[PDB]
Design a binder for this molecule. Structure first.
Ligand SMILES: [Cl-]
Ligand SMILES: [Cl-]
Ligand SMILES: [Cl-]
Ligand SMILES: [Cl-]
Ligand SMILES: [Cl-]
Ligand SMILES: [Cl-]
Ligand SMILES: [Cl-]
Ligand SMILES: [Cl-]
Ligand SMILES: [Cl-]
Ligand SMILES: [Cl-]
Lengths: 296, 298, 298, 300
């Protein structure tokens, strides 16, 4: 198996005057690289994938690929869709523009059956020869990839190598690795990075690492090296920030934090996303004071 | 206040496929069948119509066919036009208008979970971009978000052409809340099994999946209720419960297309991935349930 | 079949405390006030009456006071008598009958989560133990289990004295399901905000929290609906929505007892732990909502 | 602070209660407890949910606690008696009752059915804790009670009451477990969900109150002891091996599946429950029967 594992960041997409701030994007990626991160995920949920155009999607993947060139950092591009023909197109597109692998979210809104999910991902995996990571996030999609479906896809499709789980369900994580220990289970929920890793998970795709790349990468690496004592210490230390970064829908809080930290110049979203309430803005600002935030 | 509205018995149209493409002649035939069986409006390219997997050109074709087929009749076209990206939703609204839609149905942003403030700005932008009626669509089970009663009411009061909401949330308490606080809006049932309860509380129409198969029955239920013939409306809602329930034994529109195929109303049981045929067990359950109903032909 | 029934407008009675004991004089006055304001039955020692924290002797006293206060009137006593242990629930049913109850309300077993087969056997045992009417009570948010439609219908058909169900599940779909398949049963609303929708679908009464405070309004709503005056019933249901909602801002009966205290209808705002007074903020919200309503004294 | 040091942790079993001809089978109960003791178990919990507390009489409650205390006497095994109620006055009475009958501590479930507020829950447990001088373990199980003890409430009770020493969590919410131990690392977090015993322990949890251990006490006790010694590799191996049985033991409401397994294993003579509990469906019975055949089940 070719795989992409370790500490990985779901990159925010900075905007300036309604456009992707391309210089800022490259600079943010360089900061990730210099702080121990193993891979970056351009144009996922945290990157406002829903509201980007196809050309902007291309631009972000290209910038990620170029910034990571000559480094150990890989690019796991977001490429999911709820239409199979579109997801196949996107997987091919990502590979065309130099991605090392793709993250492909379960179809949102149209609620396919397990058989549909199996055929969806089989089509995607067959369209490219790079690694594919499934992404289960039922609170956002309205559907769940069952354990049996994930395992069948892993066993049947050479390049499907694991799943990013964002379902708040540690029982499912036990189920997955007890039955198919060969897969790469990746945490998609920051607050529980340590519990997932301590049960044999092999990485994280993190929102929090946008702000604290050094701490998330340290946690992940400690855990992978079976230094559970030190990984847990960091996971506990991070709980407050990990929680507050979801006080409103991601990436509203993380972009607010990045702005407060002076890491992006404009606190700007594309509708229907918008700035947080004053109460939540103030909570985010206060929680941040307890952490050492690396600059550029 | 004096909004234009689209209400009454309405159908969320399925989209038939043939050899991987939209079967345009079948689509027209199905719409004419709805018209001839008492339906007041049709919704092309919504969820039941597999909007997620149609191309932009197909979206255009389906709307154009619906508009053309309804010409020379009272039947209105309420086009599906929602997106989870506000700039896209605005473009879809203008696009539907340009192609002759009488109004638009605009689903709450799915997957990206905007806040209420974001939902308000989303729909304000859409409503400002066209001069035709806009019906909000709340279906939290699919979208991952809910347009709150406060937000719906604020939109209704602030934007002239937002005239109501299609509710698909299995929450009759919310239906009471909405009409108690803002009795001028058009509340539209988006859940077939509870069509009668929504109408009897002051709802003014339905956007139905079941009416694809049984348009005459859904039409009668709605008009009985609008005329305050509640005993007759309830009787039909009760008779329809079994089919209303089986049409969601797998995710819509898998069961309704299966039923249309079984009834001989479409030629092939064909979907676009990630949708697919139902399990053999569910296929058989649908077939058995249908035997209790008189299904209008062409 | 021709079952004895207890239907119409009914009140889930609060239990007033004074110095840590049941205030028996207050209890009697509160019941007389319900009788004088058009209520058809009262329910002593249910959830709203803090049944969990009353002793066996207090349970006895409350039932005896309800029965005595209702003598010489048409008002019925539907006594709370459920338990999560079948042997206990049988004992409670016999006990309620012994002390003069006209029927019993028997909640689905809480906490131990029996299966449908277990629920069927539970209620079959209870119904066999007495010759008075038994009303099932489904409230999954409190019990952790749900009596399915099939189970309810099987019980109704198999056990002569089980005559229907109080539904408090926020699920109008299930109300449709129940009466579409078994129209002979008495469906009773257990959720005040949706009293009208349940009645307009053929429900035959309510067991209300709000009627503690506004008995004449709940009675009128119910009787308008039973006479098929749906416009008038809906008008009251809509007017009541604000109070109906605020009465659950914290777990019932915390808000209703607060409201009764604010209205001057009980002397002290006293609960038995683990119930306690509402937050300062919720106390203020309840007071403000009440200002819009006419409240009758004794 | 003596009390702060008095805890009951390690591998613990939520005991089933065997019936024979509608009565508690006292000989069988003693025998089953001895089997737990001889297979590495650190404490037993008589008359909890798994023991069908809801349907036992007060006299049967006393009998079960007495048998547990006597059987554990002279061993290091502790008795953590079920003593919760949704009425505070009753819960206080039950705590005193458990103490007077020799229990080492009590397990006290969050009030079911009546849905108290967090302030009510705090007052409920403060009353209970002040009534006895033995350890109290809170028990959060929202799917059964209809309420949840919030992290803030749990931490406040731990900080305010000397003898409230931790919480048994059965909420399938590992985030909450992180939250609890990140903010109050001195408490004893106890797993109440067998399938995730290892994840809870590896995050600093200090024991389990197990249903599965009724059937496989040796495997649950080995897992727990490995984890407490930071041999995570070996603890995880057992947790993984156990997943199939841990899952099937909840195919219907506990203790329906565990009693079915005990019966099929010959560890109790009859598959008998008190209503409203009853035997499982034919489908689930068969699933339980087949899953068991992959495990080694110790006899007496
Ligand atoms: Cl499925
Ligand atoms: Cl296996
Ligand atoms: Cl903004
Ligand atoms: Cl604000
Ligand atoms: Cl099949
Ligand atoms: Cl007696
Ligand atoms: Cl069941
Ligand atoms: Cl307060
Ligand atoms: Cl609270
Ligand atoms: Cl703290």
């Amino acid at each position: 198996k070719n795989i992409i594992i370790g500490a990985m960041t779901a990159l925010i997409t900075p905007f300036k005057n309604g456009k992707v701030d391309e210089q800022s994007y490259a600079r943010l990626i360089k900061r990730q690289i210099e702080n121990g991160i193993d891979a970056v995920v351009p144009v996922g949920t945290t990157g406002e994938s829903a509201t980007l155009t196809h050309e902007e999607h291309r631009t972000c993947i290209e910038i990620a690929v170029e910034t990571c060139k000559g480094t150990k950092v890989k690019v796991l591009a977001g490429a999911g869709s709820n239409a199979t023909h579109e997801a196949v197109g996107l997987a091919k597109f990502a590979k065309e523009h130099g991605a090392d692998g793709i993250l492909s979210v379960a179809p949102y809104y149209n609620k396919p059956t397990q058989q549909g999910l199996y055929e969806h991902y089989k089509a995607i995996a067959q369209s490219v020869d790079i690694p594919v990571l499934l992404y289960n996030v039922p609170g956002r999609t309205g559907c769940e990839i069952s354990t049996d479906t994930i395992i069948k896809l892993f066993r049947d499709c050479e390049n499907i190598y694991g799943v990013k789980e964002a379902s708040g369900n540690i029982d499912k994580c036990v189920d997955l690795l007890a039955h198919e220990p060969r897969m790469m289970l990746i945490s998609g929920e920051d607050a529980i990075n340590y519990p997932i890793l301590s049960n044999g998970g092999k990485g994280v795709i993190s929102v929090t690492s946008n702000l604290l790349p050094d701490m998330i990468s340290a946690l992940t690496h400690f855990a992978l090296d079976e230094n559970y004592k030190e990984a847990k210490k960091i996971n506990d230390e991070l709980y407050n920030i990990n929680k507050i970064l979801f006080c409103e829908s991601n990436p509203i809080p993380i972009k607010t934090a990045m702005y407060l930290a002076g890491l992006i110049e404009s606190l700007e979203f594309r509708l229907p996303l918008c700035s947080p309430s004053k109460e939540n803005f103030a909570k985010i600002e206060e929680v941040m004071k307890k952490y050492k935030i690396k600059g550029f």
